[PDB]
């Protein structure tokens, strides 16, 4: 098993699980912010 | 990330102000009351120079510039698009530039080691202060002050130096100039001489200081010694910086006239025939 | 003169040639620089787990003078303490450490001391280069003033004894160390000061980093005629030490 | 989303706090200084302008 | 307040100090006498020599003096051999280059044969200086890190008064040998061509000058910051380190992130000082040859700022408000 | 379990708890403002 | 793609927590100002015109 | 066997399998953004 | 070839890693600014012209 | 030709690699960037005199 | 045998085995991407 | 004449290699741009030439 | 046995043998590539 | 003449033949570049003015 921050696996993955949770987070308020500037001013 | 023999060094204590509030470190770097302040006005300057690099029309490097605002407005407040972003820059900068010197202080303190580096630093925080505060408050505008730009704070030193005719024939520019050139030479040869005491040709030992002071009395008659080079070099930089400063501070305040003219008290001297 | 193409010329190739020297060379001078304080390690004394982009250079060998051997860098660290009495005051990195008992007399701090060989320094000819001035032929007082025989005035105003003899660098003629003789009531014995450390007045030498009870405590030299580099990394630190340790006020805030 | 909490078994308090004390004054300084170099939202200049 | 170490409060003198010998013999052609000056030993050392007289030493010296008397006599007689004259007017005579129509022929002596032949003494002599501080180096076995030091000087020395001129063949791109003349040429040599400002190459060696200077400031002040450790013998730090090291090491550390070590900072020492002239004699090279408008070579190549104001005085003010009349 | 700052997990919940609090009063007060910003002289 | 989490097994969060906060703001201002730069999508000046 | 890092043969098989799901999704990505952008304007 | 993955006996993934990431936004980011730079491709003139 | 491997008895492979890596893409980029500066192999300005 | 990096005979074989074959793939690709350009506008 | 294999007992193989690559592409490269110097040689203008 | 980097005869017998053939490849491409350009542009 | 070997009797071998191959190469880049410099010798202009 490879590990250079001497975490375990299970750690990882529970770290990852709520890492994500977030981006996706992240991402769903850019894309809202996307849509209504387009619908605002277009560039397409 | 410390290294092997750094963690005995790090201990608590001599701080000027804040105490234990602002006591720690983020990576190699120390904070303090002084980073903190450092971090603000360094950030809002880079910010504000950016926010002017746009509101200009380019953001190329070679091309941004900033200037200060025109000779009518005198000494009072500019509209920020006419040169007060310049005035707002500059005053981030020297408080960036005092809160670096203080907390360089605090390291010494706390490392329990002299305070020759901030005291070196001061020089050169002299020196820009008087090419920005000192001479444009004597000459009455802060229009005289350099604009921020990496290939347009070239045009202002050529126009500055052409606009008395020869700046060479300056008495303090060639005291300046010396300086510098001496103290260029003094560090090759104090780099070369460690260098190469340190590394003989292969398969010899290594020497030490009395192989270095033979060479030099060898080579030209006199050695300075390991301490005395130190000094030299110290002062040579302090006084390149002092005289660098003198220099430009007497040419627009005090003298008026071209500079070869100032000549005339050694050519029209009575005791020539 | 012409173009390779579009605005390309011998000025163009110069500059980029030279672009890629300095990328080079910057990349040499920052790895010939990486040969002692590595890898690094984190506040537990543990390998951490980043260790730069930067990686290590290859071996150096040094022939040293009189025998003493050889050395190679990069590599293990001969001059690594063993046991310091420090503290956490926190469960990550990036928090001080605080002293377990007296860090004056314990070397950490502004105190610390390096594990430095326990043999003297030998010049040329192969002699301790620091020999005290009575045993010196033929050196004398040239200009300044002669502390020898003046009294000794610590940082808090306390006259601890008189300086009786002085340390100096044959090879170089340059005063390296001042000996004071200490009061009963103060100590016994002798003990020296670096000439850094000092201030030579008319009638006095004031010593400003550690107080009068503070002297009794200073490391002493094994031999009476010679000090080797662990001895005097010792005793020089020690003194360095009382600019923070010597007094509560000197610690805390200035404010 | 619910697991946000856990943020704080990562990063002390000490540091983080001062890090967005910095932050949130820097942003609010230049958003308004770049407000304030602006014709149609300098509101020093429009009360000399309507009066 | 503490003591700064920067004059020493006590002086001891002893037996004066002969030098450290090998089987190469260098005492046999060292001299004998030796002298002390308080005066200087308040800072560094008090003896006074003695110095190692070779041949490359002697015959440097003979022709720099026999160069530097051709000139002062050639301006003496250019005066009319007054002495009052010659001490008015010293700082404005000069042994000017010869004229543009020569070539690369050897001209008349009125117009430049005495230059040539001051510069051919002054060329030998510089070569032989050079010659002796390598053979010094030689014979006490140790590097050649000074004679390459010089070397990257004497590029520039050479550059400036030997290759240029055959390469844009012809004598009269010399510099003359004068105090307010050789200024005079540097200006008019800026102005011919250009602006040298925009000289990419010139704007680096300002960048190594500068970094040159700063970084003996630097030094200086952290050497002496650490002396109380014994931070001047550098040496015995480097062989065996000490905390002095490590404390310097540091206080760069905890200020902008990365450090050095005892031997590394002398290599960042050289390499900087020695790229000043290498920088420049490349840049002074390409002048004239390559390029002769670096303004417009700066047009050309898109970094040359452009300005929306208007141009003259009475853009901006009234002759009779500038008198306040 | 992973905890880099020796914290608990209880302990880690109370701290969110009061940071949240604070934050949503921040963010309501920086809304009034900019509703009221907007309506004295709009940008959109 | 299920073994994604494994990057944590190399790389500490501690410091790529601070390097994408550090990036993701610098490329936000970035982006904002260079819209600012133009004229059709700078809303200041849109604004000012509109009135 | 040779290895210059101290890992194993089935370590770095798992983490090249790893990297080159990643690349993969990578690719796949600007392959479909490089075919809207070709229909929107397209070069050659 | 099916032997590719012995690349990560030479080579230590930390440092790699950090070098390609580094490097492919440089490379985007400079693709980007080369469109922005030309005539027929930048969005945002030809935006303020369709308007 | 067969014993051609054993160029890596004596270059070790760790710094060939690297430097091998560096100079291919300078070569391309550097390729790439002298088609551009011709007019008849420039294809966005070919796409751009095209429509 | 005279060895400067520690590498033995083998381990060179298959190395330089690894290496050809990325070479190869490598040069591959650059031969049809130089038919399609030359296809497309040729030189000579 | 059949005795050339004795110069690796006088020089070191390690450094002639690398001195040999570098100055090899360096020569390659001056040859090329020497070459596209000319007007009759310049292979990227005769395409436009017989276009 | 006149030496100075370390090798012996065999050693120094094998590298030059090797080295040749990847000169004389080298030089037959650069052969063609000559040939080949002269019959495209001659220069004499 | 036929004892013209005993020059390996007083120089090193070693440095003599690196000075011999830097030497020679400057000299042949010399002459080149000369001969490049006239204008009757030029070869690379004569293909064009035969043309
Ligand atoms: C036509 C042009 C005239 C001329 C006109 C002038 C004028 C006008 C000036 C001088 C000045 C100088 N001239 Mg002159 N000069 C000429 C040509 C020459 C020649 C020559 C021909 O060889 C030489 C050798 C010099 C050299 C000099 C020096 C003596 C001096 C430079 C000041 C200095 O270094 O202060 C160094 C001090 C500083 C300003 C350093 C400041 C550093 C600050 C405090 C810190 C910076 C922090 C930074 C922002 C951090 C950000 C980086 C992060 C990593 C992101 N001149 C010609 C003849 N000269 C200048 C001078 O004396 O200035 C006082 C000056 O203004
Ligand atoms: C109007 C003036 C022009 C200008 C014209 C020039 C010209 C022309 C030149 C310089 C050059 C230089 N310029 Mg400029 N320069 C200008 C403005 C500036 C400013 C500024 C405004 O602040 C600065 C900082 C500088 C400074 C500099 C240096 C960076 C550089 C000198 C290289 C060097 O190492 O010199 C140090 C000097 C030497 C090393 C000379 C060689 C010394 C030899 C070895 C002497 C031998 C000893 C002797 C024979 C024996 C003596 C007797 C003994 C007692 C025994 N310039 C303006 C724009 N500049 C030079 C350069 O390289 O530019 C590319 C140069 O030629
Ligand atoms: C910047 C470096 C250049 C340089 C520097 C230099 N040379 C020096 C010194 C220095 C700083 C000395 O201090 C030393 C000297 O004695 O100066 C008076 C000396 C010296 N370099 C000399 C020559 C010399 N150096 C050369 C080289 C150089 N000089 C460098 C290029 C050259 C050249 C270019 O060819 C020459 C010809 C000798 C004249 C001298 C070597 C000293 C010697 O051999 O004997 C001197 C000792 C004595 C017999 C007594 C001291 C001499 C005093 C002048 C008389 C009494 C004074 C009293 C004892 C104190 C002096 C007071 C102080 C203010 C000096
Ligand atoms: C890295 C680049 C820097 C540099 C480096 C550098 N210079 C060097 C060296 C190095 C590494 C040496 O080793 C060499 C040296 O000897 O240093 C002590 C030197 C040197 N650089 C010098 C000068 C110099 N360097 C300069 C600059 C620089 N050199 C750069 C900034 C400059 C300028 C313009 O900035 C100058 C003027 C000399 C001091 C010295 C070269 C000595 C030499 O060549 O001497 C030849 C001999 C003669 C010309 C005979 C002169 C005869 C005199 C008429 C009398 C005898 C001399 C006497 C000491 C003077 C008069 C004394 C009076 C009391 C009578
Ligand atoms: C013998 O002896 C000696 C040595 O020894 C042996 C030596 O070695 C040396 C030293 C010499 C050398 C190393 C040679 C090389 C030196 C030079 C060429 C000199 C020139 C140097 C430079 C060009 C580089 C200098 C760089 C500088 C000044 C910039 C570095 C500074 C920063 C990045 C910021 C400083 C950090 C601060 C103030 C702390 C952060 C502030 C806070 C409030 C902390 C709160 C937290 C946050 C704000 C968020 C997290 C913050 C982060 C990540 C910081 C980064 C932020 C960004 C925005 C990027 C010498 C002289 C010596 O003689
Ligand atoms: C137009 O052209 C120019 C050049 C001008 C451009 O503008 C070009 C621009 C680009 C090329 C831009 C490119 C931009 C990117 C590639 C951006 C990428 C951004 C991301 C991948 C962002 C990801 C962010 C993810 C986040 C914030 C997710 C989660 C964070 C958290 C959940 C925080 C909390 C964490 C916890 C609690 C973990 C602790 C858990 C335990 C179990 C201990
Ligand atoms: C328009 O273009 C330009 C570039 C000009 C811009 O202006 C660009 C602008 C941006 C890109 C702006 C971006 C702005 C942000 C991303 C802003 C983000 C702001 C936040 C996330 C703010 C968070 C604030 C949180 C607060 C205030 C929380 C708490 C505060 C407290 C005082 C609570 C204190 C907590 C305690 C005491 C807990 C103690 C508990 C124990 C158990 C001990
Ligand atoms: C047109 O002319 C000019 C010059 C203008 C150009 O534009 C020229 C341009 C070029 C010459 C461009 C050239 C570009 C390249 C050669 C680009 C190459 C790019 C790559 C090879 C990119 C590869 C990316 C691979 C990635 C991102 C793969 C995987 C990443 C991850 C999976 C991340 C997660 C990692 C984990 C989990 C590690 C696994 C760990 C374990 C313990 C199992
Ligand atoms: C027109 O004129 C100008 C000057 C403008 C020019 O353009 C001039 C141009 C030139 C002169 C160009 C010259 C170009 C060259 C000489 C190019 C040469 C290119 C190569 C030799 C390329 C080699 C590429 C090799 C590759 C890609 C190899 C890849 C290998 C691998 C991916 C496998 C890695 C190996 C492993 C993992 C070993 C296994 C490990 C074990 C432990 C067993
Ligand atoms: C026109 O005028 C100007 C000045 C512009 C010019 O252009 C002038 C140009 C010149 C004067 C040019 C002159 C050029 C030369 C003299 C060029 C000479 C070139 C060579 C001698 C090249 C030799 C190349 C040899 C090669 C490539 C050999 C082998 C290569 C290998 C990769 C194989 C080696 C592998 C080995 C040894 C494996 C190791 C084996 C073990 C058993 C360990
Ligand atoms: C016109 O005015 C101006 C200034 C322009 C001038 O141009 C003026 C020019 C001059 C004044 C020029 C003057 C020129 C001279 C005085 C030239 C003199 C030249 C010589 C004396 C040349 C001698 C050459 C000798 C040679 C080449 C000898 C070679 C010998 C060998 C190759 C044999 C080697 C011997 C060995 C190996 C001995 C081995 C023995 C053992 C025991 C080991
Ligand atoms: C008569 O009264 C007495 C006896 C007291 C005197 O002798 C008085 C003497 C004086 C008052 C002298 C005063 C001297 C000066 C003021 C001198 C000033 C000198 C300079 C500023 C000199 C600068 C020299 C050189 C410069 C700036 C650059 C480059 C030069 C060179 C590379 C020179 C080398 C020349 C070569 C290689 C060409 C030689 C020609 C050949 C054909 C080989
Ligand atoms: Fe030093």
Redesign the pocket.
Known sequence: DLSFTGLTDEQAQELHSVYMSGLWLFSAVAVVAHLATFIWRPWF | ALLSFERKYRVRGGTLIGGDL?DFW??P???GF???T???F??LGTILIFWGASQQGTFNPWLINIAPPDLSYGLGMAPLMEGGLWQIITICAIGAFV??AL?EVEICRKLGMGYHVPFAFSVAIFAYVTLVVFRPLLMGAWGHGFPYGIWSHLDWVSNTGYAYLHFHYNPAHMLAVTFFFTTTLALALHGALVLSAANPPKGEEVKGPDNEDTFFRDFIGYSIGTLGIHRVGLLLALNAGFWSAVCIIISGPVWTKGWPEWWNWWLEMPIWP | EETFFGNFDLASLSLWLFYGFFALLIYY?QTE?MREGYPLEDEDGNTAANQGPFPLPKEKTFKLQHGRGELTLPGEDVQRRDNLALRKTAHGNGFPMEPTGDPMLDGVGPASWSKRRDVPELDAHGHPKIVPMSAAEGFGVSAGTDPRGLPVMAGDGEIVGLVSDMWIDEAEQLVRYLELELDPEWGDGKRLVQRQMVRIKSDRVKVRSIYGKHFKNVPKTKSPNQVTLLEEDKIMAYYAGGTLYADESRLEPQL | MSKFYKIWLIFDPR?VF??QG??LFLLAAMIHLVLLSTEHFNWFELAAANA | PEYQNIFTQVQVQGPAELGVDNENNLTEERTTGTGFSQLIGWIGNAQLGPIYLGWFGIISLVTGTLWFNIVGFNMLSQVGYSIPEFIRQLFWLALEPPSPEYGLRMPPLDDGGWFIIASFFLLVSVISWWLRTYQLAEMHKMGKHVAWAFAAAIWLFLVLGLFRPILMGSWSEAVPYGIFPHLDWTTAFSIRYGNLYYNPFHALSIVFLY?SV??FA??????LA?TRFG?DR?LEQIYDRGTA?ER??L???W????????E???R?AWW?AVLTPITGGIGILLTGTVVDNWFLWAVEHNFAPDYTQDYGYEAYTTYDGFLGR
Not at chain 5, 255 to 262: E, H, K, Q, S
């Open positions: 602002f983020v990576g770097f120390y904070v002084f980073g903190v450092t971090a603000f360094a950030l809160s670096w907390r | 001078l620089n | 540091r001062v890090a910095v932050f | 970094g700063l970084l630097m030094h200086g002040a952290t050497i650490v931070g550098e090291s310097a090491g206080f760069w550390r200020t902008m992130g990365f450090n050095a070590t005892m590394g900072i002398h960042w900087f």
